[PDB]
Each structure stands twice: as structure tokens, then as C-alpha cells.
Amino acid sequence: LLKLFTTMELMRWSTLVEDYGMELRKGSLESPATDVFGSTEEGEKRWKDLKNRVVEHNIRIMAKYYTRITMKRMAQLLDLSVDESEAFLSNLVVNKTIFAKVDRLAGIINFQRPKDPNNLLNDWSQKLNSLMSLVNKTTHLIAKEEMIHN
Amino acid sequence: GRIKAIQLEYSEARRTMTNALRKAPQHTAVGFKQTVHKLLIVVELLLGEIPDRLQFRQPSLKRSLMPYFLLTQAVRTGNLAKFNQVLDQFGEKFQADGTYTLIIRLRHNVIKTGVRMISLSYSRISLADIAQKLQLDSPEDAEFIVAKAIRDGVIEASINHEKGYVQSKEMIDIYSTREPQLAFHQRISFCLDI
Amino acid sequence: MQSGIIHAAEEKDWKTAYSYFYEAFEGYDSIDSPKAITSLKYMLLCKIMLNTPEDVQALVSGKLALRYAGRQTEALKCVAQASKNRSLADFEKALTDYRAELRDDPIISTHLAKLYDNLLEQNLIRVIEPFSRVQIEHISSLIKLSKADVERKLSQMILDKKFHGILDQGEGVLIIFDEPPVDKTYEAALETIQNMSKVVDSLYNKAKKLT
Amino acid sequence: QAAELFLDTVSTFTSYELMDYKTFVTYTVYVSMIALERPDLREKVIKGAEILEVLHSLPAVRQYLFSLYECRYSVFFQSLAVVEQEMKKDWLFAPHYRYYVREMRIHAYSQLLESYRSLTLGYMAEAFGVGVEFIDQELSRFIAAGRLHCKIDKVNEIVETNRPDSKNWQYQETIKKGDLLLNRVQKLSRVINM
Amino acid sequence: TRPANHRQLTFEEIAKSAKITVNEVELLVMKALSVGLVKGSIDEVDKRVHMTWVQPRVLDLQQIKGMKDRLEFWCTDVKSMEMLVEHQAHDILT
Amino acid sequence: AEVKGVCTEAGMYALRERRVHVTQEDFEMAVAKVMQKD
Amino acid sequence: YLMEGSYNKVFLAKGNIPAESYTFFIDILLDTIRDEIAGCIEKAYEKILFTEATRILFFNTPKKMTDYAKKRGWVLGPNNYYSFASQQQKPEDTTIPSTELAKQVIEYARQLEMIV
Amino acid sequence: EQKMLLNLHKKSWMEGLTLQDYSEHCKHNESVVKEMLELAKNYNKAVEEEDKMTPEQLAIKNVGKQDPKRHLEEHVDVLMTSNIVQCLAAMLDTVVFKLI
Amino acid sequence: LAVQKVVVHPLVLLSVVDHFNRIGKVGNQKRVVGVLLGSWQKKVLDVSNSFAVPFDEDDKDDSVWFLDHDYLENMYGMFKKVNARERIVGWYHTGPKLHKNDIAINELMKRYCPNSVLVIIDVKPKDLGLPTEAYISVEEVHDDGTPTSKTFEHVTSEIGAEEAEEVGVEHLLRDIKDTTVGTLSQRITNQVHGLKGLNSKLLDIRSYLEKVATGKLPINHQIIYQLQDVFNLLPDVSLQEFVKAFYLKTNDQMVVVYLASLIRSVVALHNLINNKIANRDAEKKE
């Protein structure tokens, strides 16, 4: 379960319940369950917060890989309704947690920020700097091959 | 500069006439200044540019440039009727001034500027409305007039013959083009020249 | 205390009104007066009207204000929470739970209309922040106000430059724009040209007089 | 600069040898509506206690000021005509009465179009209490002048607003104001040599 | 396979070439992006995947020959501007 | 000197209220402080 | 009329010539106009109808379009529509003139250093 | 030995084609141009002051007070090489490092 | 790695050149090997002194080679006595390129300095590159299953001088070093040198690929992996977004150049005003 929150990939909340829900809430006689998601009021609140972390992790994954996604696709991928997923995304956007612009008429979520001209050329400049270092590094790697095979 | 003006070489004419004013005497030779100012105004109007309003304010040039001041006003609005009114009123003065031939060529320029504001102000304008705004004869004549403007680069637009209107192209971000660099280059290289 | 009340009544700057309530609080607090809580109320009200609701919680947590922790401090602390969260629904909930401590105080009551207007702008901005093009009816549903009221306020917000956007009446959509900041380099260049033109004017007098 | 200097002395006015205080506040309001942005107008003029007290005795000036702020465009245009005649008979504002009213009309047109993506020509005409043709001629003249960021779709009578960046407007002035500087430098070198 | 100018794979091409459902294309790119096999981004609205980088792979002699031919054009361009800057800035060159 | 000090104290009272312009109340509060208090 | 684009009045000038000697040079000039006005149509009109161009081109017989069309290489469309899609050949802003730009900026360095 | 000592402070070939950060370059463009805004304002005063001022104080009065003309030249000289080099390096890298 | 940068002082270059000359005088030598002395500052090496050591290698067999390590210890005690802050930081050899037995010599050098840095100082005056090429011995753990071997990893080299060392260098370079060229001209010459240096690097790769194509050397599969990254990093300057950004940024710098040139011209006019006033005033009194 901890590895799942480490992996940089989507995790489905429904899959979590059918794979780890019993082991976390009710547990087993061999491995007793903790009070973290117990049947009490505090446990129920923590279970809901676990769902919030799962969908927050998914939106975090959805922001690194996607540039544009559909509200219909996000809701399906978040195991939430369209309104709930929009409400959840809106809260993250307000708290500056994740940048996202919602075109609600077209149902389009835009994860890429307005690209500054400085950012475009700096990325271009960083590509040249890495390219020049790679060319220099390749030449030294070529030099070793000449020494061994001469 | 007068030679280039007659030979339709307006761009090089304007440079020389502007240069002629600079090297003219600063306190005397008023008559020479009036003659060059009169020709520079027409060449500036012929080139599609705008005459400087300050030159009409001078005490010496105010009386002499008044017929040309009304001519510039008529060309500015891009209206044929206003341009022609100046012609039937100051025609003899232009003839006695040796500039009547170049004023006649301004009729094409009056059409040019009037079309330019029509495209600059209207996203989609009917051809009949273009004829009314330019005081042309019929929309069919305005059809060819706008068509030549599009091919000459005067206005970036398209014409829908079936519908009967002209659709102006969306204005492109001029700062994202080389035009600012070109304008600066002709200004930077001149500063370094001084 | 009276100096702050009239200063707040004349809708002047609230920083000076807060200061008068601050000294009125200390004087009432030092002599252990029952009116110190009343001055404590308006000290928090001034902070809310100063668009700094975060300072309200800090003030109540102070040692001098711990003794007066009660319904009156709770009423303004929860209203500051509504302003802090930019929630208009919380403001009405605050105005209902603490109606006696808020709507019945004559000083607070006269400033509730302005507080409602201030919180409406903040809630509207929060609502349209996650959007780049959003239906007005969705804004009305989230804000729980009429569509016409939302549309009128948004146009007035656009005119006041409170947020950058346009209103499409035909489709009922507010198009929020991510404007770029003005280029201060061009701004500084323009004034440098103006300032250096005066140098040429100074050089002109020096040129003609000495030659 | 007049608005900034007038507003700093709206509460310290003792220059009665130049004007009466009501006239000073009247001019202060006038220059403020043409030189101040909407947020600055509200804080300094609309909510200014010193001006508001004087405006109690000047219903026409208060009507003129608040009509634009409250978006009563039909009222504002009627008040603008009144301000024109007052400005025509004023020795200070007479050379600029045409400029100010033209600029004020530009402000009103831009303010109405600022918050809306597109407005019909009829709605603009109804708001200002004028005809459709009058709005057409006025909008076309100001758009061509580059003062209004909108374009007219005359076929459907729709005015679509634009959002040109400040970079374009900053670039043109640098070309414009820089050119004015270059001529002085160019002409100063001319005086130097001879 | 595709050149760097045309590395915008649509969802249909990935689905067809991998024999997977179009809805499963999106999860496939995550695994490649997360593991590090490819670098890029997904445009779900346009159903296109913007790959910008791939893991380098073993190349045949013919592919290396094509790689060397690319250096021939690259070297010519660098030499061309080296002479251009040298010729244009000859007077000010130290 | 006392009259001059009243003016100087009048400007102080404007600063205490973070005002730019000195009002009549400031002069009156300055008169009370300079004469009666001191 | 020729410079302003009033091509319709150019054709009407044939009828009102001052003298019978004037007829010859009109014919040579009219051939130039026909190629010119068609050049206007390609850049201005995105699409025009087949006999819609009859009064535009001042062609009497419809067959006179067919021989002129292939000389101009005009693609006739199924709906009697001449498609003039050629604006795709823009001023080519897609390419940055690096060599021209580098030449100019180098020249500034010359005017700052080569002076001495 | 003389050629060998010439390698001291010889910058690497990577540095010549390396482009300065555009964020800092624009901020440096921003700050220095803002500096000329004040210097130009002071430059105007220096022109009028020196007109009515005796030739014995042509230089003594310049001691301890900054010269707007001198600083304007330095700012212009600094800015001209900063932008021209950045522009030329950007143009050279456009064709030298090209995908086609 | 353990070294981020190696700074070789001009004294070392002169010592290495002299060392190659004096031994090369008596007998023709493929290379001469010495010991590099210097200090350590953060992760940048500061090679500042060097001494010669006896060395000989048979050309036929790389295994046969002799380095007088007892001389190496004896000479260190000399330099440590004079300058205790200069410790053994590696070795040098004047061979134009690396040798197969260099990894073996480094092991003998490694026991005096665990992070020994080999700096190849080319006596021949190369026109473009720096004469020094710093290397460090590292364990290249291969992913093909081949056993881990000892390889030299390149470390960036820079020639820097101490304040007093710089003083002597400028004295020796006084006549030939032309400092009259302005800063703007110097940067453009750097750009020309950058174009030449990049071109030479690209020809070296092309020469390597040409030999690989004809079978002169086999496929390394690390260079080819690196080469794909190099060509993948090649930006597309024909994108509309990049072109618009390039145009937008270029125009931003042009106006600043325009403003600076505008200020320059009038300041130049002010100088001409003063010159004519001074000339007119001088002739009036005379």
C-alpha cells in the first residue's frame, strides 16, 4: 500500500477497497487491524481522508503527464462524479496545490500554465547546454575507444 | 525630389525633400521652405503616410499651406467627395503652384486610406456599405477596388461574392514578428551613424 | 471608544479606528471594566473591514483577550473565518448563529452591508479562480445568488479591474483571461526617452547661445 | 498632471485669486474623468469627501460625474454636451474642448464594451440614446484611430471586443516618441555643423 | 520510428499497434512515462500523445551510417556560420 | 515660541492619525497640550 | 482607374474614346487588365462561382473562360466553384532569418568597435 | 611557452555559444534601463548647471558628486554588449543547433 | 565524482613544457611523466606545482614501464618542506593522448593520493583547445555483464593563475596580448571560437562514426546511446511557439539597444558641443 502511494502512476480507489479495504478496516486474526480506519467516527473520517489522498495523488499524477484532460475523463479516473471531481479540483486550485484551468463549457482541464517567452527560450537554452555537454562527453567516450582499439 | 515625385519614386523623393528642409537656412529662404513644404505634403500623402500637423502652424507656412491643409484633411477621411471638393476649389492654386499633377494621383490614395480604415474598423462589411463610405459609384465598382487592395497588400481581407461582404483578417500580433526588429534596425543604425 | 465609533461611522480608514479601539480596550482592560469586551468586538470588526481576518485569531489568543473569550469573541472569530475562507454562505451562517451578538450590535449592524459586499467579491473571485471559461449559471449555483445579480456584479468587477475577464451575454459564459504584467522595461524606456528629450532641449539652448 | 495636482489640493485650496472653489472642484472633476482610471476615480473623486460636499451645490457636475461611473450612458452623453458648451466658453479649456469630449466619448464607448465580449449596435445605440448609424460612425472613427479595442460586424451589427497586449501599445509610442527625439537630435546636429 | 517533428502519436495508432482498447492507451503511456521508457505528455482532449524522448537503443551499422550522414549536414551548418561570423566580423575579430 | 510650538504639535497629531493634512482639531488638541498640560 | 482598381471603368473607356485612332492601344491594354483582375481574384477571393466571374472578367462567351482557365491553371470545382486556396504560402514567418539577423547585429558591433 | 601562457583565462568553447538566462537578462535589462531613467533626469540638470558655472569649477565641483554623463555611458556600454552578444548568440544557436 | 573541476596554474604548464624539453633534448621521448602538487578547495582541484620524476616505457609492450617512486617520495619531502600546503594531487604526462598503461601508472600514483587526478598537458600548441585534459580513475560498472574495469573519467579543466603568478604571465605576454580589443569584440571572438570548437568536436564524432561504419572499430553502444540523446536534444526552431517567443525576446533586447544607442548619439552630440566651444574659446583668446 505504501509503494502504491510512492509509484508515479494512477491508483483506483475502488481497487484499493477490494484489495486493501478489508485488511485495513476489519483486518485479520493473524494480522490485527489498527484503529486508523476503525468503525468509529474518527475511523470513518480517516477513511474519507484516505479517499481524498487517493484522488489528490491521482490529480497530482494527472498533472505531471497530462497537458489537457476532459472533465468526463478526470471524473472516471478519480472514481468521482463530474461535480465532485470539479469541486475537488477547484479546492486544490484555490489552495495553490495544483494548477488547473477548467473550461467548463468544453469540459477541458488545462494543466499547462501560460508559457512565458522567457520559459520557452530558457528551455531551449537548457537543451543547448545539455547538448553541448553531451557532445563533449561523447568525444571523451570516443577517445577511450581509440586508445583501447589502436 | 521633385524629379522623383513625377517618376512615381515617392519613397526616395520623400527622403530628399525632408533632407532639403533640414539643410535649408534656419531663418531666411522662406519661399524655398514653402515650395518644399508644399511638395513634401503631397509626396507624404502620395506615399500613404501622414503630413506633420506642426508645419501648418508656422506663421509663414499657414497662409501658403492652407489649400494643402484642406487637401490633407480630405485625404485623411478617405472620402472621394471631400477630396473632389478640394479639387474644384483649389484646382487653380495647385496649377499655379506646379503641383496639380500629383494631386490628381491622390485620388487613388484617397481610396487606399478609406479602404484601410474600413478593414481596420469592420470585421465584416457589405460591399454596398463600402461604396457608401468611400462615396464610390456602385458596389460592383467597389468590388474591384477592394479586390486590388487585397492583392496589393493594402488590407488583409477576403471577399464573399455570393454573400456580398468583405471579411477582414484577424489582426496578427505585430510584436511577435520581425517588424519591430526592422523598425528598430533602421532606428538603431541611424543612431550609431550620428 | 467613542472616537473609534465615530471614526468607523464616517467610513474613514479603519487602521485609525482600530487604534482607538485598541487603546480603548487596554484602558477598559486595565480597570477590569465590563465594556472591555465591547471594545474587543470592534477591534476584531476593524480587522475584518481592513481585509485582514487572519489577525482576529491572533488577537483573541492574546493573554489580555483570553479572559474575555466568550460569545462576543466567538461571533467575530467565526465571521473572520468566513472572510478568511471567502465563503458567503459562512457569513449568513455566522449571521444566524450569532445574530444577537452581531445583528443586534448597532455599530456592527451598520457595517454588515459593506461586509456582505466585500465578501461577495472575494467569494466570486474564489469561485471563478479555477475556471478559464465558466457558465454564469454555474457561478450562480455555487454562489447561491441570482443569475442577474451575479452577471451585474461580475461586469462591475470587470470595470473595477478586480479581475480580468469578459462577459458573453449570448452564451452566459465568463471568460477569465491570464493577462501578462506590463513590461516595465518599455515603461522605463518611454520615460527615459522623455527625460532624455529634455537633455536635447538643454543642449539646444547651449548650442545656439554659444555659437 | 492636472488631475494629480488638482486632487492633491482639493482639501488645501486657497488660490481664490485664480478661481472660486466650486469652479476648481468642477475642473477637478472634469480632468479626473479623462485622466484617472476607474479604481482611482472611485477612491479619489466618487468617494472624495471634499468633492462630494461641493457637488451638493452643483447638480449638473455631479450628474455628469456619476452618470459615467454608474453606467448611465444616455445620461452621460446629455451631460457631456452640457460640459462641451461650458468648456467652449472657458478660456482655459477652449483649445481642448474638442479633444476632451472626443476622449470622453472614447472612455464611455470603451467602458461599455470593456466587460462584454460582444454587443449589438442597437444595444450600444439604446444605451447612449442615439441611433444605430451614429454609433456606427463614432465607433468606426475611433477604432480606425486605434483608440477602441473592438471591431464592428456590420452585416450582423455586432461589435466584437479585442484584447491587444500592452506590448503593442508600448512599442508604437517608443516608435512615435523615439522618432520625435531623433528629429531633435538630427536637427541639433544640423545646427552644430554650420 | 517517427521523426522528432512528427512524434505526436494519436490514441488510435497506439491502440492499433499495441492491440489495446483506445481507453487503455492512456494507462499504457503512464507506465512508459512513470518507469522512464519514454518522456512526453498526453493530450486527452485531442487524443494525442506528445512524446519528446525515448530510451536509446542498440543500432545497426546502417542506422549508424544514417546517423553519421546527419553529422555531415550538422557539421556543414556549423562551418557555414563559422565562416559567416568570421567574414562579417573580420574587422572587429581579435 | 509657544504659538510656534502649537503648530509643530498640530502636525504631530496629524501624524498620530496617519493623516497628510492638518485639521482644525489637530490645532485645538495642540493648544490644549502646549498651554494647559504644559 | 487602372491604378485605383476601377477595372469596370477601364472596359467602359473603350466606348467613349475621343477618336477612332484610339481604338488600337485599348486592345493591348485590355489584355493586360484581364490577367490583372484575375490576379486580384486569386488573392482576394477564396472561392467564386463559374458564371459569377463572367461580368468580373468581362468575358462574353462562357467558352472563353475554359481556355483562359487552363492558361491560368484554375482548378474548377464540382459546384462550378473556382477554389483559390493559395494563401497558405504566407510570408513564411515559420522560419527565423538567423543569418540576416546575425549580419545586422554584427554590423552594430562594427559601428561600436571598428570606428577606432 | 608564450602560446602556452595564452591559455590562461581562455574561456571554453561551450561558454561562447552558451546563452545567458533570459529571466536574469531581462531583469538586468529592466534594472539598468530604470537606472538611466534617474540618470537622464540628473543629466538634464548637469547640462544647465555647467552653462552658468565657472571654468575653475569645471572639475572641482565634480569631486565627490556623481557624473550622470559618465554613468549613462557606462550603462549604455554595458547594455549594448549585453544585448548584442545575447542576440547574436541566440541567432547563431538557431541554425547551428537545428533539428532538420 | 570526487573532483568537480581541476585548475592548472601557468607555473605547471611552464614546468611541464620545460620538463619535456630538457629530457627530450638528450633523447627522443614519446612523453615525460611528473607529479602534480596542489591544494584542495571544496570539490575543485588547484594544481599549482609539479616536479619531474624518472620515467621510461617500452613502446612495444605497455606492461613494461618504470617510474622512480623513491624519487617521487624524496622530491615530495623537498616541496613539502618549502610549501606544506601543496600535497600530491595526481600526475601528468605530455603524451598527446591517453595511453593504455595510464590506468596502471595511476594505481602507483593512487597510493600517495587516493583520488589521484591525471592531467594530460600537451606540449604541442593546439590552436583551439586547452593544453590540459584532467582525468580521474573510476569503476565503470557495465550493464552488459562484462566485469567492472578501471576507466578514466574526464574532469573539466581550467587554467587559472594566482595573483602573483598572473603578474608574471602578463609580463611575459605584455607584447603579444592585445588588450585594446573591446569587450564586445572579445565576446564575438569567443562565439567564433565556440563555433570552431563545436565544429571540431562534431568532426571527431563523425570521424569515429566513419571508422565504425567501415569496421575499423566496433560499436561501443555507450557512444551510440549518447549520440541518440544528442540528436534528440536538437531543438526544432521551426515551431510557431518558439519563433514567436524568439521574435518577442529579440524585439525586447532591440529596444534596449535602441534606447542605449539613442542615449549614445546625444551624449556624443554633447561632446561635440563641448569640443566646438573649447575650440572657439581657445581661438578667441589667441
DSSP type of residue D159:
E
- Cα C4 to the center of its chain, rounded Å: 19
Contact between chains at I255 and C186 (C-beta distance less than 8 A)? yes
Rounded distance between C-alpha atoms, residue E35 and residue E56, angstroms: 15
For residue E43, what are the β-bridge partners? A68, E48
Q: Which of C59, C44, C52 lies closest to C108 in space, CA to CA?
A: C44
Rounded distance between C-alpha atoms, residue E67 and residue I224, angstroms: 9
Chosen for mutation from I265, I271, I280 (greatest number of chain D CBs closer than 10 Å) is I265
Phi/psi of residue D83, each to 5°? -65, -35
Domain ranges of chain B: 1-127, 168-194
Cell output for D19:
478661481
Radius of gyration of chain E, Cα coordinates, nearest whole angstrom: 20
- The amino acid present at I260, given as its one-letter code, is A
Which residues in chain D precede a discontinuity of more than 2.5 Å between C and N? none
Distance from CA of B183 to the nearest CA of I (A): 10
- The amino acid present at I113, given as its one-letter code, is C
DSSP type of residue D43:
I
Please enumerate residues of A whose Cβ is less than 8 A from a Cβ of H: 117-118, 121-122, 125, 127-129, 131-133, 136
Contact between chains at C188 and H37 (C-beta distance less than 8 A)? yes
Those of residues 21-50 in E touching chain A at CB distance below 8 A are: 26-27, 29-31, 33-34, 41-46, 50
Rounded distance between C-alpha atoms, residue I138 and residue I153, angstroms: 6
Q: Which chains touch B (3 or more CB pairs under 8 A)?
A: D, G, I
Q: Which chains touch E (3 or more CB pairs under 8 A)?
A: A, G, H, I
Rounded distance between C-alpha atoms, residue B84 and residue G65, angstroms: 38
Contact between chains at B141 and G6 (C-beta distance less than 8 A)? yes
Q: Which chains touch H (3 or more CB pairs under 8 A)?
A: A, C, E, G, I
Output the CA torsion sign for I82, I84, I85, I91. Answer: positive
Q: Which of C185, C161, I147 lies closest to H79 in space, CA to CA?
A: C185
Distances (CA, A) of C85 to A69, A101, C44, C101: 28, 20, 16, 21
Write the residue in I255, I266, I272 that is nearest to D174 by C-beta.
Answer: I255
> Are the C-beta atoms of residues E76 and I221 closer than 8 Å to each other?
no
Contact between chains at A132 and H17 (C-beta distance less than 8 A)? yes
* Nearest residue in I to D172, CA atom: I255
Write the residue in I251, I255, I264 that is nearest to B191 by C-beta.
Answer: I264
| CB proximity I185 to E under 8 Å | yes
DSSP type of residue I236:
-
Contacting residues of I for B176, CB less than 8 Å apart: 244, 247-248
Domain ranges of chain I: 3-183, 224-283
> Are the C-beta atoms of residues E11 and E48 closer than 8 Å to each other?
yes
Output the CA torsion sign for D125, D130, D136, D141. Answer: negative
Which segments within D48-193 are labelled E, that is strand? 118-120, 150-153, 158-161
Distance from CA of C181 to the nearest CA of H (A): 13
| CB proximity C192 to I under 8 Å | yes
Q: Which of A133, B173, I92, I25 lies closest to D165 in space, CA to CA?
A: B173
Contacting residues of B for D189, CB less than 8 Å apart: 194
Chosen for mutation from E6, E52, E57, E75 (greatest number of chain I CBs closer than 10 Å) is E75
Which residues in chain G precede a discontinuity of more than 2.5 Å between C and N? none
Contacting residues of E for H92, CB less than 8 Å apart: 81, 85
> Are the C-beta atoms of residues G102 and E81 closer than 8 Å to each other?
yes
> Are the C-beta atoms of residues I155 and I193 closer than 8 Å to each other?
no
- The amino acid present at C119, given as its one-letter code, is L
Alpha helices in chain E (DSSP H): 11-18, 22-35, 61-88
Write the residue in I184, I232, I236 that is nearest to E53 by C-beta.
Answer: I232
Contact between chains at E70 and I231 (C-beta distance less than 8 A)? yes
Rounded distance between C-alpha atoms, residue I86 and residue D72, angstroms: 85
Q: Which chains touch C (3 or more CB pairs under 8 A)?
A: A, D, F, H, I
Chosen for mutation from G96, G101, G103 (greatest number of chain E CBs closer than 10 Å) is G103
| CB proximity C188 to H under 8 Å | yes
How determined?
cryo-EM
Distance from CA of C188 to the nearest CA of I (A): 10
Contacting residues of H for G112, CB less than 8 Å apart: 80, 84
The answer for residues whose C-beta is within 8 angstroms of residue B121's C-beta and 6 or more apart is D139, D140, D141, D143, D144, D151, D152
**Residue A133 host element (H or E):** helix A117-148
**Residue G82 host element (H or E):** strand G81-83
Contacting residues of I for B185, CB less than 8 Å apart: 254
Which 3-state string (H, E, C) describes B121-182? HEEEEEHHHHHHHHCCCCHHHHHHHHHHHHHCCCCCEEEECCCCEEEECCCCCHHHCCHHHH
Q: Is E9 helix (H, G, I), strand (E, B) or coil?
A: strand
Contacting residues of I for B180, CB less than 8 Å apart: 247, 251, 254-255
**Residue G40 host element (H or E):** helix G23-44
Q: Which of A32, A27, A31, A24 lies closest to A4 in space, CA to CA?
A: A24
Chosen for mutation from I204, I247, I263, I267 (greatest number of chain H CBs closer than 10 Å) is I263
How are strands ordered across the β-sheet holding B157-160?
A: B157-160, B165-168, B122-126, D150-153, D158-161, D118-120
| CB proximity G106 to H under 8 Å | yes
What is the experimental resolution, given in Å to one decimal place?
2.9
Contact between chains at H47 and C185 (C-beta distance less than 8 A)? no
